[PDB]
Ligand binder design. Sequence first.
Ligand SMILES: Nc1ncnc2c1ncn2[C@@H]1O[C@H](COP(=O)(O)OP(=O)(O)OP(=O)(O)O)[C@@H](O)[C@H]1O
Ligand SMILES: Nc1ncnc2c1ncn2[C@@H]1O[C@H](COP(=O)(O)OP(=O)(O)O)[C@@H](O)[C@H]1O
Ligand SMILES: [Mg+2]
Lengths: 240, 241, 562
Amino acid sequence: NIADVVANSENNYFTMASERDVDGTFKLIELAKASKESLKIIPLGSIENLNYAQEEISKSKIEGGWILLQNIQMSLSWVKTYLHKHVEETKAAEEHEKFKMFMTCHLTGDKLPAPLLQRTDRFVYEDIPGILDTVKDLWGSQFFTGKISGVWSVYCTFLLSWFHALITARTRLVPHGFSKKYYFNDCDFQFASVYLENVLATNSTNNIPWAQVRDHIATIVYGGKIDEEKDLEVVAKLCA
Amino acid sequence: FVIEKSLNRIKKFWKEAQYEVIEHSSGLKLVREWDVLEQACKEDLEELVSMKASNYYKIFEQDCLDLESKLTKLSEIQVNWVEVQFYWLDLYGILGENLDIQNFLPLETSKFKSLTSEYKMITTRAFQLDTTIEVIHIPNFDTTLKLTIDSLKMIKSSLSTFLERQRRQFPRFYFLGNDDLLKIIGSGKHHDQVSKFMKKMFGSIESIIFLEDFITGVRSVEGEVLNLNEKIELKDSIQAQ
Amino acid sequence: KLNKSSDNVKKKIEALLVEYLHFNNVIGQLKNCSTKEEARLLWAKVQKFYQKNDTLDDLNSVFISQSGYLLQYKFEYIGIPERLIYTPLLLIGFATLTDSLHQKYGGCFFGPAGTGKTETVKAFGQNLGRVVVVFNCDDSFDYQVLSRLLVGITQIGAWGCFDEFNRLDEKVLSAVSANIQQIQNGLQVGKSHITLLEEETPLSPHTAVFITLNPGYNGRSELPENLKKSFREFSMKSPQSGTIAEMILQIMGFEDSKSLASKIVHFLELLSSKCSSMNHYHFGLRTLKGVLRNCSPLISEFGEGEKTVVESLKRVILPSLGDTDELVFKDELSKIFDSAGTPLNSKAIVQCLKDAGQRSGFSMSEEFLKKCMQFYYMQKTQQALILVGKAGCGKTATWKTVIDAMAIFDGHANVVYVIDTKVLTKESLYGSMLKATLEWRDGLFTSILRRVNDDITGTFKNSRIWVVFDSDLDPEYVEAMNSVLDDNKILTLPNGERLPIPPNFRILFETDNLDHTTPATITRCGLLWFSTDVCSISSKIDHLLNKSYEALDNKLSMFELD
Ligand SMILES: Nc1ncnc2c1ncn2[C@@H]1O[C@H](COP(=O)(O)OP(=O)(O)OP(=O)(O)O)[C@@H](O)[C@H]1O
Ligand SMILES: Nc1ncnc2c1ncn2[C@@H]1O[C@H](COP(=O)(O)OP(=O)(O)O)[C@@H](O)[C@H]1O
Ligand SMILES: [Mg+2]
């Protein structure tokens, strides 16, 4: 697992790549809480986050704490200009206080610099949870933020979590299931949940608006990405 | 003599080279074709520095050093001179051709007028020499060019800040380039050529309908006339923004 | 009321009829619903407008409701824009954009070119009373202007659309992606001020950014990874061409508009499937709309029947087709449609052509008359024309003969400037600027454009002007007159001032190849295609003999010559 390759290796640089479907940042959090803790999540992004990352990495290489960079695939430009040269200059991680650098990339993402990849240790995440595990995760994560409306909102959120799990399970099979590889991130689930809350608040506390709930979820929320009639009708029948 | 002839050719070329000038409508002497003599000076400097590599350099080292010093001074003169002319020519399009913009910026206009007078004096002094290499013998020629370029760049920065403030006053101006914005600002008493920029900053609206000194309404790109509720009154002192 | 109205109010009535046909369609759909639940379902998707009454604020008293989401209406003047027909796909696009905007997300449309993404964004802006500003990409377009425009959009709170966001250089792509991400994060989080263009500027919460992505070389183009989180993509399916054609024909007053629309769409898709694929063949929605628009001048000559549609299809589709596809077009027209093949207003002009060709020595064969007729009817509508063939087709003979015939017919003088576009440099054709003294030189095309506009002699008003670009055209040279080719019809010089072309100013491209021109140029210009030599192998010999005889007649006696 990630624990064995981290422990047995002597390099302080790791690149834990994965598919766009599933990310193993929770696995890295579990590894950190298992030993040495001191893990900071650094979400790459806008220029403010870019500067925060380029300062926090320099701080961590001295203080020795762990640090993780998510989605290098959306910050190649800074990686080529800063991370590549910084790792080249600090390839002697032993002279500095011992600290661990983690990069999460995408196998289907963009090309990464050859020296950076060859110097660092490499690892791949393939732990694809089952349908039930995804349902449990979605059900647990919703209620950490508290309740927003009546009980029907909870019931609809449960139904939507099951639907999201089924969709994500089907999207991993080709050409059976979905004829094309599609990625259904948490944004789709968030949008569908907000629409469900809106339709429950405005209309009534009854089971009446299902006819438009199914159509809106199938044709706009989860159907926006889809440009094939076969996949559209698959999503439509799943929603029905 | 294989080296003597090259040195003689360099001297002979620099004893005749002279910049071509064209008279400007403001009395200034504008230089055309900056590139030819600058390139000639740079190539001659490279030839002189490559001459030192040959072991026969001692015989003509004194002449080579004199030419090296003269050409380095000329290069330092030219680098500042070309860009001084460029900045002055850019700023004269903005200031000095429109009374209203001058009224908006009195300090900048005064500084630009002083710079124009000083640069005119310097250029008139330099162009009597009839040679572009003798200009290095004019005392404090380079320092005057440095002062002029610094003052022109500071004036340009002040103008840019003024334009940014003008845009922030009326955010629709961000759809107009600096040229168009200055054309609008300078149109103080006219306030009727602003309509040509309506399609650029207001989208559908194509022009304005002025009646006497009142804005009755605007018209779209399809010719549809929209009539305002209360006609806006315009004065001579009112700003375009 | 449309038929007895002035042109300015005709435009307004035509724009209103789209919405009233939409109302009729929605009411008819609601009538046929067998359940109250189905009626409510169908009514939810349709864009519903409301006016508040408890809110004193006048400018925010009207809001838009679709799928349960409410969007305010900003009372910005939009004029009388070309209204889009309310197809179900259009309503789904509106619903997607409303869904994205309710969360302060962005809106993204992707799909093959010609499905109506840019126009859908613009129409959604129009229906909310906003003027969506379009940011054309890779069109003489730098990044400083993008920064300025984005700052203006954020400060005034307008809506921005990045048309063709897939085609632009990678550096500016990344910089603009960073700026867009900053804007979108500022919108979602809600911070008053954002930092773009190295400056902290205020951000109006009503700002929105839309992006349209045409397909790439590989296939479906994708947003940059950073933007993928702040935008909601939406695939644009093939538009309901039948509904669009039916509503346009009904507005135009054509009888049996449903059958006519079905026949036009079926004919165009048959042409797409049957004709050999060529890079200049476009039978999409834009071509159908151009055919429908071109029917209006023909209404007075023929009427509002099917024959007008057939004649317009022959005016637009046919001249751009090759020799092997002309018979396919004729067969499909004879099959789907049924016309008598009798063109009106083609008797005096035909005689003028015959007189001009006889005077010039040419022989009026069937092919030559056909090509001259196609040129003459094409030049009425399009300002710029592209004559394509092989070396020796008869392009210059065709347009010289037609110009002479029109001079005889209309009585208008013709001034022809033949320009070889590839011999002269761009700096010599459009003029150049001296970077040392800022003295603008006119050039060649701009000089004659100035002469035409500044007709001090007063002759260019009562005469046609032709500028023929005899050499083969390339994208770089035509990029400097693309503004002339657009509906703007102004020559935008790099500096100095802008020159507007008069309606008399015609531009011809007597090229022989189309292997480099972008499809935008050929879809903005009337393309006439020569697939076979206009004259036979004996007509050319007779013409050359006549030319040599008239050359010799100047110095030889009559009896010896004869
Ligand atoms: N009706 C006709 N009868 C006889 N000869 C004709 C007729 N029409 C065209 N031609 C001949 O065909 C030629 C017409 O001009 P041509 O097509 O060669 O010019 P172009 O379009 O400028 O050139 P290119 O196509 O080679 O670039 C001439 O040689 C002319 O004699
Ligand atoms: N719903 C519609 N009703 C009427 N015309 C439409 C509709 N959708 C698209 N069109 C026509 O299709 C043409 C091209 O669409 P466009 O928006 O240019 O596609 P893209 O965004 O892919 O470039 C436009 O001229 C427009 O008139
Ligand atoms: Mg478009």
